[PDB]
Structures are given as structure tokens and as C-alpha cells.
Amino acid sequence: KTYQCQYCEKRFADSSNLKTHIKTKHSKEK
Ligand SMILES: [Zn+2]
Numbered sequence: 001k002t003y004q005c006q007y008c009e010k011r012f013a014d015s016s017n018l019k020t021h022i023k024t025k026h027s028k029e030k
Pocket of ligand 1: 007008021
């Protein structure tokens with residue numbers, strides 16, 4: 001129905017939001 005992350009516990013509304021999320025919060029801890 002919805003998509004979620006596997007690194008942290010955040011949710012997204014499409015697999016587009018998620019696609020960016022990762023290099024926002026999981027950008028090599030920087
Ligand atoms: Zn995450």
C-alpha cells in the first residue's frame with residue numbers, strides 16, 4: 001500500500017520519495 005525504509009524507521013508516499021530519502025538521512029552518515 002505504502003513504502004518504508006530498512007535503515008531507519010521512516011515511511012514514504014511512492015518509491016520516488018524513498019529514492020531520495022536515502023541520500024538525505026543515509027548519505028554515508030554525513
Ligand atoms: Zn531511512
